[PDB]
Design an enzyme around this catalytic site. Structure first.
Site, PDB file in Angstrom:
ATOM      1  CG  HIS A  45      -0.448   0.410   2.475  1.00 19.36           C
ATOM      2  ND1 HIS A  45       0.005  -0.513   3.395  1.00 19.36           N
ATOM      3  CD2 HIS A  45      -0.316   1.625   3.061  1.00 19.36           C
ATOM      4  CE1 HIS A  45       0.416   0.119   4.484  1.00 19.36           C
ATOM      5  NE2 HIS A  45       0.227   1.416   4.310  1.00 19.36           N
ATOM      6  CG  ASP A  89       0.022  -3.859   2.749  1.00 24.92           C
ATOM      7  OD1 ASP A  89       0.457  -3.406   1.672  1.00 24.92           O
ATOM      8  OD2 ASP A  89      -0.124  -3.170   3.786  1.00 24.92           O
ATOM      9  CB  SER A 179       2.701   1.310   6.667  1.00 28.13           C
ATOM     10  OG  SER A 179       1.460   1.441   7.332  1.00 28.13           O
TER      11      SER A 179
HETATM   12  C1  LIG Z   1      -1.199   5.543   7.110  1.00 25.93           C
HETATM   13  P1  LIG Z   1      -0.475   3.917   7.123  1.00 25.93           P
HETATM   14  O1  LIG Z   1       0.650   3.836   8.093  1.00 25.93           O
HETATM   15  O2  LIG Z   1       0.036   3.707   5.650  1.00 25.93           O
HETATM   16  C2  LIG Z   1      -1.741   2.655   7.536  1.00 25.93           C
HETATM   17  C3  LIG Z   1      -2.594   2.334   6.254  1.00 25.93           C
HETATM   18  O3  LIG Z   1      -3.432   3.077   5.806  1.00 25.93           O
HETATM   19  N1  LIG Z   1      -2.577   0.945   5.934  1.00 25.93           N
HETATM   20  C4  LIG Z   1      -3.287   0.370   4.837  1.00 25.93           C
HETATM   21  C5  LIG Z   1      -3.071  -0.917   4.526  1.00 25.93           C
HETATM   22  C6  LIG Z   1      -3.545  -1.562   3.282  1.00 25.93           C
HETATM   23  C7  LIG Z   1      -3.346  -2.926   3.012  1.00 25.93           C
HETATM   24  C8  LIG Z   1      -3.808  -3.512   1.843  1.00 25.93           C
HETATM   25  C9  LIG Z   1      -4.506  -2.717   0.940  1.00 25.93           C
HETATM   26  F1  LIG Z   1      -4.965  -3.249  -0.187  1.00 25.93           F
HETATM   27  C10 LIG Z   1      -4.712  -1.363   1.185  1.00 25.93           C
HETATM   28  F2  LIG Z   1      -5.376  -0.634   0.275  1.00 25.93           F
HETATM   29  C11 LIG Z   1      -4.244  -0.777   2.356  1.00 25.93           C
HETATM   30  C12 LIG Z   1      -2.548   2.908   8.803  1.00 25.93           C
HETATM   31  C13 LIG Z   1      -3.715   3.585   8.920  1.00 25.93           C
HETATM   32  S1  LIG Z   1      -4.365   3.601  10.508  1.00 25.93           S
HETATM   33  C14 LIG Z   1      -3.065   2.671  11.147  1.00 25.93           C
HETATM   34  C15 LIG Z   1      -2.915   2.257  12.474  1.00 25.93           C
HETATM   35  C16 LIG Z   1      -1.808   1.504  12.837  1.00 25.93           C
HETATM   36  C17 LIG Z   1      -0.904   1.196  11.814  1.00 25.93           C
HETATM   37 CL1  LIG Z   1       0.453   0.206  12.227  1.00 25.93          CL
HETATM   38  C18 LIG Z   1      -1.039   1.598  10.507  1.00 25.93           C
HETATM   39  C19 LIG Z   1      -2.146   2.351  10.125  1.00 25.93           C
END
Ligand SMILES: CP(=O)(O)[C@H](C(=O)N/C=C/c1ccc(F)c(F)c1)c1csc2ccc(Cl)cc12
Ligand SMILES: *[C@@H]1O[C@H](CO)[C@@H](O[C@@H]2O[C@H](CO)[C@@H](O)[C@H](O)[C@H]2NC(C)=O)[C@H](O)[C@H]1NC(C)=O
Ligand SMILES: *[C@@H]1O[C@H](CO)[C@@H](O[C@@H]2O[C@H](CO)[C@@H](O)[C@H](O)[C@H]2NC(C)=O)[C@H](O)[C@H]1NC(C)=O
EC number: 3.4.21.39
Length: 223
Positions: A45, A89, A179
């Site tokens: 992502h 992911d 991430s």
């Molecule tokens: C902003 P970020 O760190 O990039 C993270 C995020 O949005 N993750 C998305 C994953 C993902 C996986 C597969 C997919 F197909 C997809 F489209 C998205 C995030 C949002 S709240 C939160 C709280 C605790 C942690 Cl550790 C990370 C997060």
């Protein structure tokens, strides 16, 4: 990283900081980790139109002579990456040139037994709280690998594909911007930070690396 401490500078020399230009233009950052001189592993992502990786960093706003900043020449998102289920992911990045292995820049080994209950560590430059900015310095925190049932509130959580990380009875957690960073258990990469709750309450969901090692090997062997 929430509830963590500042890393000893350069004590985690495989850590990569990713600057990502998304397809639309707005920039994003992620963590990742060096696994070969010219390959970084991170979350899918975190893909974008272009990516630059910074290796050898501690304070990401201030260059040091340990820095190696390399452009990514190709992104390899897992073919089953799925924005509905949030599965698969994981992404490999080929760097335009090979990084030089130094004291500050090195690779992280893969494993090949960590059951729920094991204590792991995760590092990153992510937000240090819900209303906080990303950290300028690399932070790390010790987190409990939870039974997959502890993540049963996350729709589509799959214990084969994912790890459940962070004791819900404490505030310590990976968070936004962490991430792509590795979960280290007994000195081996076991997971990749993926997602969690917006309100920062653990556990968070990580990609289970062991499940994807044959795919990683497939990509590496064809490069
Ligand atoms: C902003 P970020 O760190 O990039 C993270 C995020 O949005 N993750 C998305 C994953 C993902 C996986 C597969 C997919 F197909 C997809 F489209 C998205 C995030 C949002 S709240 C939160 C709280 C605790 C942690 Cl550790 C990370 C997060
Ligand atoms: C990370 O590095 C940045 C940039 O050098 C530090 O921020 C600077 O801090 C000095 C004081 O030490 C200020 O005079 C500058 O205005 C700051 N620059 C910027 C861009 O804000 C920052 O202190 C470092 N972080 C840590 C924890 O050491
Ligand atoms: C993302 O995952 C979903 C859910 O598993 C996929 O949708 C299913 O696709 C299969 C294909 O054989 C169908 O049998 C199901 O009916 C689908 N379910 C739904 C709710 O549509 C989807 O195709 C996946 N997307 C990608 C990019 O692989």
């Amino acid at each position: 990283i929430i509830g963590g401490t500042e890393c000893k500078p350069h004590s985690r020399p495989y850590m990569a900081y990713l600057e990502i230009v998304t397809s639309n233009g707005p920039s994003k950052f992620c963590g990742g980790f060096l696994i070969r001189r010219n390959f970084v592993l991170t979350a899918a992502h975190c893909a974008g139109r272009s990516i630059t990786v910074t290796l050898g960093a501690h304070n990401i706003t201030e260059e040091e002579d340990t820095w190696q900043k390399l452009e990514v020449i190709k992104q390899f998102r897992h073919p089953k990456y799925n924005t509905s289920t949030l599965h698969h992911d994981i992404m490999l990045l080929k760097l335009k040139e090979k990084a030089s292995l130094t004291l500050a820049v090195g690779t992280l080994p893969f494993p090949s037994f960590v059951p729920p209950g094991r204590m792991c560590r995760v590092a990153g430059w992510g937000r240090t709280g819900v209303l906080k900015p990303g950290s300028d310095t690399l932070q790390e925190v010790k987190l409990r690998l939870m039974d997959p049932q502890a993540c049963s509130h996350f729709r589509d959580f799959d214990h084969n594909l994912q790890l459940c990380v962070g004791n819900p009875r404490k505030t310590k957690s990976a968070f936004k911007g962490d991430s792509g960073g590795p979960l280290l258990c007994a000195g081996a990469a076991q997971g990749i930070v993926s997602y969690g709750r917006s309100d920062a309450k653990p556990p968070a969901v990580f990609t289970r690396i062991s499940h994807y090692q044959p795919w990683i090997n497939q990509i590496l062997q064809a490069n």
